[PDB]
Amino acid sequence: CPSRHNFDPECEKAFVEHIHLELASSYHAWSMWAFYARDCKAAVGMTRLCEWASHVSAQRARRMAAYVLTRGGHVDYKEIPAPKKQGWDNFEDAFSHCVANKKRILTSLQSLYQCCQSKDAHCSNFIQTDMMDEVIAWNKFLSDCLSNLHCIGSQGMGPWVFDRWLARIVMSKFKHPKIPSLSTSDLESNIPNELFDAEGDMVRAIKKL
Amino acid sequence: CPSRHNFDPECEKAFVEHIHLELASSYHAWSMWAFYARDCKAAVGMTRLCEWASHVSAQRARRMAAYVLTRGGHVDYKEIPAPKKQGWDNFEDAFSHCVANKKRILTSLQSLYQCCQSKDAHCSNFIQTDMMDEVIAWNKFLSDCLSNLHCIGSQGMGPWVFDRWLARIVMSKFKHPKIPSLSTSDLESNIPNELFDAEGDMVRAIKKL
Amino acid sequence: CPSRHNFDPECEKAFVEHIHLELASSYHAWSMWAFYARDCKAAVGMTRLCEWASHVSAQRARRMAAYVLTRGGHVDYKEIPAPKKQGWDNFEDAFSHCVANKKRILTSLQSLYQCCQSKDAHCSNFIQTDMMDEVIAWNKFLSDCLSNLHCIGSQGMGPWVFDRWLARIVMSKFKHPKIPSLSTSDLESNIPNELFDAEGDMVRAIKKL
Amino acid sequence: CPSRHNFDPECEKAFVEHIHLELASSYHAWSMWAFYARDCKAAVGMTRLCEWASHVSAQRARRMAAYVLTRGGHVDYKEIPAPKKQGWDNFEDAFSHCVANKKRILTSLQSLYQCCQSKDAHCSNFIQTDMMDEVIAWNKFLSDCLSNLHCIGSQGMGPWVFDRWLARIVMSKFKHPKIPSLSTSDLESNIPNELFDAEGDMVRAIKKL
Amino acid sequence: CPSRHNFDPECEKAFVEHIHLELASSYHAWSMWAFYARDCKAAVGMTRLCEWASHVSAQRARRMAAYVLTRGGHVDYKEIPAPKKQGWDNFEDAFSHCVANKKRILTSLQSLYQCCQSKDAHCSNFIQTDMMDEVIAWNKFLSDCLSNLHCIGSQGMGPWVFDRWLARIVMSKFKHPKIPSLSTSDLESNIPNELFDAEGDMVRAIKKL
Amino acid sequence: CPSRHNFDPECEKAFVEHIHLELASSYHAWSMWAFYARDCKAAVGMTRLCEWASHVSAQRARRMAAYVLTRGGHVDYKEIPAPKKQGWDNFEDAFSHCVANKKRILTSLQSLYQCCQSKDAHCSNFIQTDMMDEVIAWNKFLSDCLSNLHCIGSQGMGPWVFDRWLARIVMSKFKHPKIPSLSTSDLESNIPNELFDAEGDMVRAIKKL
């Protein structure tokens, strides 16, 4: 690419660093999702919450990369580290871990805003609108859940009831759809391949209406 | 977890290795997507294709992890390496790279099937049905695209027309929906937070019908 | 205003006093609402109940002022004192506080009825129909809730389950709509201001039908 | 509450002060509403406008309190002073009073923004988006009304015609709905109380559909 | 352009001159629109009328340029002068100014018709049908408004009532729609840019029906 | 106007200067539109794009003037200069010209934001939200088009295919509606004029429904 100008290089470097931070957070949500789906754990609410969190983090990383590309910069990708701890004694530890991660993300975003505030107004507005609001809302939600868990306790069937309630409230908002793909079903109908005749299909449809 | 039995440990280790391979492929698709979206490249068809491929690979990794968890095993996650090359001279190089990756994936899957064939019939059936068909179909599609590109050439406006056609045929099958999240809009309406009243909303809806 | 006759001045003074009492009750509900919405409390049911109570008290004060104005009197407003206690150890204390406030309101209303009974029949009918019924019903509801809470206990997850149930039953009856306002969105469309062309809009609508 | 951290204490104090300012403005609108509804005044347009203004101010105070609670702070409520003047010679004086109040509110908000600008980006964005826009729009509308009134005059039937027009344009935007409550109607049907069987009702409804 | 023949050069020059006259009239309507929208004027009817007039004049200039291009000529653009007076004592002066401008436009059009009448029949028909009718109708409307204003007077609330009526009658005929544009909302969905995938969208739509 | 206070005079002057800049850009788009519509050029896509750009620039100028009027200032209009060059060798030159103009606009807006940042928070928010986003998006789109054109070439039928595609994608978003006007058709039906009976028509319509 013979064009990487306009955008300030230091801001570009900091943006790429934050992109990698978001990718690491998305990866770490996967480990929690896998941990709580074991046949000896079977906690449906935590599973749904962790899946939703991982998808949200991936979308945030994609959005920041798209913003960097819109201003005319380049994005360089590097190594993604493995999560350190892959087990939790109870729900309180997991919620505390998530709260600490949110605080770290907010600190990084504030540093970015401070860096880009003097020159680029649009960049600072993007930082303070499209990236911070989600973090603030998620932090409030997680803090409320943590307070409720601390009040309820950690023995008996209290955690089970809490998990059922959490699954109910999470499923009312998020539901991941399936990703379509290709297969060898009906081989005799798609001889070269399935996609190559798409245009033709469109013509057929117009003749039906 | 005091339960990790039944599933053969060697098969579990090989399955985890293949999961990491799929995750690496998904990560590498992101670099191509970012490369072809630069303001000095602006190739819409390649962008759509790479986005679709990354989502497909992520779904495949999730499916294999779910199968391991269903049989009673554990999944341990480790480091994801960075892609080596992040630039391509023309479309032919990118398509060749993808074809080679597909061949590597197929070889790994065949080794897995050979390992698990003697004892576990269900595992071998899962390998040969739910994992190989997608790879075979994608390999055929990519080979057809590569042959067409080689016939067309690499100079003039041929690649531009090919890219427009590719975008048209890809968009007829895949369209990634947005992931819902939380925000601070309408603060006075969701005082503790937005999710905590979900159950109440349901009751209201029943009274309306 | 050169007209303040007909209505008995002593009745007018007592009515104004009761209006200020209702306003004070409405203000005190706000403190409870703010207390139970803290991130370290997060009790959704109590929040909904307190919000509903504050709105009900405000409506009652408005109704009494409207009745005074209908009979030809004047309303003079004075200072609203701050609530004394702004913290509660458990739900039982809050419910007891509300019950005591209801008893005080009922005593004041009975005194008003006694004052106005001899001369004005319409005023006494208004007092005994439009002001007392709400208080009686609310007192019964709060007493039932208090008895249930005392039976349940104050330790473990009993209060959490009670709070969830309370939110469910309150939300089935009350939902505060948003108050519309003015903004600077679409500045080029409402040049003087948004309201000044309302009449014109009406004409347009008639031409569409 | 063992948690009041994160939020800067000086910003919290200033926010609470502004909350009390908004509450005072909401209270003062009530006096104007009561003044213009007397049987010797009977100005419908001014009544509607003052009612709308009081509701808007109350909503603004609620929104600021909710924002403070979301960031993890506490809200402490204090005394609300009585309005000073409770009579106006003509509409021009009332409109001038409202304009001056709007200017005072804007100055306070600007001071808040200056205080919180250096450290918290999200707080400053909230101040400049969710609080200032309404004030600017309302100030423009009130200034336009004041200019029209000054041009029209103050004698004859000019003010009366203006009052009809104002009522017409205000009523096209705002309409306060009734607040539901409890009563003793149909006593034999709701024996413990009306709310306690809400869940049961829902089941019945599902069986009807 | 190696083709500028057929069309008579003198007619082309006169047409370009009239195009610039229409553009100047459109520009001058903007100043009146801005003058009557000040917070110390706030005349909604005059604002609507001036906005409509400016749009009409711009459309007329576009139509004349299109006619010149259809016959095979060229259009050369030059400087647009500023309006001389930017204030008016009352509505009568503004209406008189508009009437005088209409008379000037009609004189110019008559000169054009005289110039092109001998040779080109189609050009003269275009002048007498597509350009004069609007001017005649607008002149009649403005003269009627001026007579009504002169009869009404210039003191009291007469002009204000007239302004409401004018706004009502203008708004029943004209309403300028918003012009769509591009933005950075939903950045993650339109990665290269929003327009480049339009064709693909069409295919998707056909598959839905 | 005896009222021009509140708004800072230096900010007002800078705003008026930027308004004139936007008007000049809108005027210059007209010359390109006229150039590409000649019978010896006949490029439909460029014609549509230039028409859309001119309308967008006019709307932006109107929006900035409306914002100045809302804050209580005055707008003074001056002379609009003629465009310098009115011919282009190929599409690349036109796209480069547009990109340079966008860069100039962005620099001016950044200077405005710097000027108004210290005192007025609402003004700076308006600058960074309602004026910069459009420029950023349009710059990205034009850069993508320029890169595609440079890759395609400048000889043969490549530009023709590109122009057809550009027309297709532009027309999917923008379509300028006709501006209604007055005429002398059906003279016997609208005797004084067409508008004067509008109110009566409304009554008739109500009687039909």
Author numbering:
A (entry chain I), B (entry chain E), C (entry chain J), D (entry chain Y), E (entry chain V), F (entry chain A): 22 to 230
Please, what does the article write about this entry?
The protein artemin acts as both an RNA and protein chaperone and constitutes over 10% of all protein in Artemia cysts during diapause. Unlike ferritins whose job is to sequester iron, artemin is unable to bind iron due to naturally modified regions of the ferroxidase center, iron nucleation center and 3-fold channel.
Therefore, octahedral symmetry was imposed in subsequent steps of 3D reconstruction and refinement and led to a final map at 2.04 Å at 0.143 FSC. Although prior molecular dynamics simulation studies suggested that the C-terminus of artemin forms α-helices that extend inwards into the cavity of the molecule to fill the space, our cryo-EM map of Flag-artemin and the corresponding fitted atomic model clearly show that the C-terminal residues do ultimately turn inwards, but they first hug the inner surface of the core artemin shell before extending only partly into the artemin cavity. Artemin’s loop L′ contains Pro198 and Pro201 which potentially prevents this region from forming into a helical conformation and helps favor the interaction with the inner surface of the shell. A third proline in the C-terminus (Pro213) provides a kink that results in the C-terminal helix F (aa 216–229) turning into the cavity of artemin. In our experimentally derived model, the artemin dimer is oriented similarly to an apoferritin dimer and a disulfide bridge exists between Cys61 and Cys22 of neighboring opposite facing monomers. This results in helix F from each monomer forming a second 4-helix bundle toward the center of the complex.
